[PDB]
From a paper:
Human SNM1B (SNM1B, Apollo, or DCLRE1B) is a 5′-to-3′ exonuclease, which was first identified as one of three vertebrate orthologues of the yeast DNA repair nuclease, PSO2 (4). The SNM1B sequence comprises 532 amino acids, wherein the N-terminal region (amino acids 1–332) contains the catalytic (MBL and β-CASP) domains, and the C-terminal region the protein-protein interaction regions, including the well-characterised TRF2 binding domain (amino acids 498–509).
This substitution is in the MBL domain, being located adjacent to the active site. The overall architecture of this is extremely similar to WT with a backbone root mean squared deviation (RMSD) of 0.3 Å (312 residues to 312 residues). The structure around the active site is also near identical. There is only minor perturbation of the Y61 neighbouring residues (R60, Q63, R206, R207 and E209), and no effect to the α-helix that Y61 resides in, or the adjacent helix, which contains many of the nearby residues. WT and H61Y SNM1B1–355 showed similar thermal denaturation profiles, suggesting that the H61Y variant does not substantially perturb its fold. The H61Y Michaelis-Menten kinetics, as measured by a real-time fluorescence-based nuclease activity were comparable to WT, as was its ability to bind ssDNA in the FP binding assay. Our study on the structure, and properties, of the breast cancer associated, H61Y variant of SNM1B1–355 reveal its fold is very similar to unliganded WT SNM1B1–355 and appears equivalent to WT SNM1B1–355 with regards to thermal stability, DNA binding, catalytic efficiency, and nuclease activity. Thus, it would seem likely that the reported deleterious associations of rs11552449 and cancer risk may be mediated by the effects of alternative transcript splicing, rather than the non-synonymous substitution in the protein-coding sequence.
Author numbering: 2 to 297, 314 to 329
The structure:
Amino acid sequence: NGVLIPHTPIAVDFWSLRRAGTARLFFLSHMHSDHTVGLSSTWARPLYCSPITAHLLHRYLQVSKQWIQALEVGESHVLPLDEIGQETMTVTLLDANHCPGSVMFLFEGYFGTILYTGDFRYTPSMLKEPALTLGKQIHTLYLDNTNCNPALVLPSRQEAAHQIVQLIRKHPQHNIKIGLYSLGKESLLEQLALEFQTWVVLSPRRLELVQLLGLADVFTVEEKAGRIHAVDHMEICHSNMLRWNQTHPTIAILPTSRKIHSSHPDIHVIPYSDHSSYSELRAFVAALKPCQVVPIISVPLIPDSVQQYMSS
Ligand code: NI
C-alpha cells in the first residue's frame, strides 16, 4: 500500500528503508496498521503527519517526537529537498475524512503538482478546499481506487449503520460485541449509544483515544455499565462466541470491507466501506481535472542538490 513518488525522495505510507533507498522525506496520512509496518522506537528518520496523527503515532508506536514534524491541516508548509539552503517543496495537508487524523497530501515542486489521496471518504465539502479552489492543475493524482473494482458491491457507511441498528433492534435482550480496528468507526459507536440509550464499554486505550477526539461522554470501561461492548476484531470468533454465550446471550458484529464468512450464526459480518464510491470519485476527478490518474510516467528534472540528497 506504500507509494514512492518516482524521481523524488518522497515516500508516503512507506517505511521499508531497504526497498525505499532514494526516500528522504517520509509522510504518514493516518494511523492504520495497513500503512504503518516498520515504524517503531528505532525509526530515526524525518516523518510528517497531522496533529491528531502526531499524538496517536507517538502514543501507540513509541516513535520519538524528535523525528515527527507535525503540520497543521489546510496550510502550506515548506520542506527542504537537500542538505543545503537551496531547493524546497510545498506540502498542503487536506482533511481526508477516512478516520481520525486522516489527511491527503498535496505536493508542489520540480516534480510538478501531485495529489496523494491515501484513504479518503469523499464529501462535497472537500471540493471547496482553498488549496484546490485556485484552479491549480494537478499533474498526477494518486487516487483511492478501493471501490473502483466492481468485484463485489459494498454499502455506504450509512447503509451499514442502518443494518447494524436493525440487527441490534431485533435483539433487545442480548449483549452486543463490535469488532473494530485501532482506528475509525468511533462516530458509529456514538450513534449506537444514542439510539440505544446505553454506555459503550471500551478498552482503556480506546477510551484514551475517544477522549483524544473529544467525543460525547457516553463511554466507560466498567463491563457491567452497558450492553454494547467494543472489542478488537480478532476477538470475534466461534470460541469466544461460546465463551460469551456461556454467561449472557451475546451477539457479535464485524463491520468490514472484506469478504468474510461468518464462522457462527450469532456473528454478523456487515460489509462496511469507509471509502469513496465510484460515482463520488467520478465527480471528484471531473472537478479536479487532473492531468493523469494513478491507482494506489513522466520523468522530472531532478535538481543537482536533490540527486545528492537521494544518494547517501
Ligand atoms: Ni486506512
